[PDB]
From Swiss-Prot, chains A, B:
InterPro entries per UniProt: 2H_phosphoesterase_YjcG-like, Cyclic_Pdiesterase, YjcG
PANTHER family: PHOSPHOESTERASE SAOUHSC_00951-RELATED, PHOSPHOESTERASE YJCG-RELATED
Gene: yjcG
Keyword flag Cell cycle: no
EC numbers for this chain: 3.1.-.-
Ranges spanned by the short sequence motif HXTX 1, renumbered to the chain: 34-37
Natural source organism: Bacillus subtilis (strain 168)
Name of this chain's protein: Putative phosphoesterase YjcG
Amino acid sequence: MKYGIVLFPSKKLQDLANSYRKRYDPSYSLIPPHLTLRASFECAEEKADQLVSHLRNIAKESHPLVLKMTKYSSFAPVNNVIYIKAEPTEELKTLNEKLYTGVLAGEQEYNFVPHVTVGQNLSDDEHSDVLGQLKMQEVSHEEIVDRFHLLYQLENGSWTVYETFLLG
Amino acid sequence: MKYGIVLFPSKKLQDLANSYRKRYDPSYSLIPPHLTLRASFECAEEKADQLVSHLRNIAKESHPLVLKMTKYSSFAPVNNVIYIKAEPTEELKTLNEKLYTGVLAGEQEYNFVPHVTVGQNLSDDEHSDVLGQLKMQEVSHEEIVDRFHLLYQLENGSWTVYETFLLG
């Protein structure tokens, strides 16, 4: 099935993101606010234990990540996704690329934009309006996240947590 | 801070439950199909370490639980809650029982009844229609769940996973 690896921030940041997600993010009812660490992938069920297996080691050789949120931004015109930008760090970069090693082997490691999505699947007009009111909305939040979660997708598209991994 | 401790069954069972929750369960968009936690409670988010310790240990002396779902039933006329019934076991009972000891001690129960909700907060009439449909609708599913999750409630009522515990 489909697996995903993400970071779930403090609820203060989840609530913040949800105050906007409730109206502009179809994923609202699919998964809590989050920061993707690896593009979701397909993995064979009996080839999962080694998965969890590798994630533990990646986790053990890492430390809690500091997340400095500084502004709202978009991926347009590449994608009408609006999000809370997170200042990229070498730590974030290293974990992301490690998630493309071993049994999560390769095909990648890159231009990684750590972010917390607050809106997507927006028409261009939809997008202008939101980015508009969302531009004059300041944001200055910083925190440390000490774990990441492995998830799998349901038939309805939602995501369920399989295992949590502590950092360091 | 609100916490809940629950079991997330296989994808196959969640999807089955969701095919009904999508229609009849307000929790549909708040949390994936689950088998309750022990009742949810109000802990001081800052004394969450104790909690996590006590849980890790309870999980230590437990074992993967077998869930054999036998049918759809209801808690009427106490609550118009329609659910999928799991066969009660000493194991589920013992673990439920251990979730009310130590720092999680407080006044427990009223019949712990292993279940997965597919419908709730229903009017008497809609409840009558759904039970008439599901009560005799066949269901035979069996699986072994090897972990439980601790989660906390967001402002919007949805629940996010804080930590996962392996049984054994």
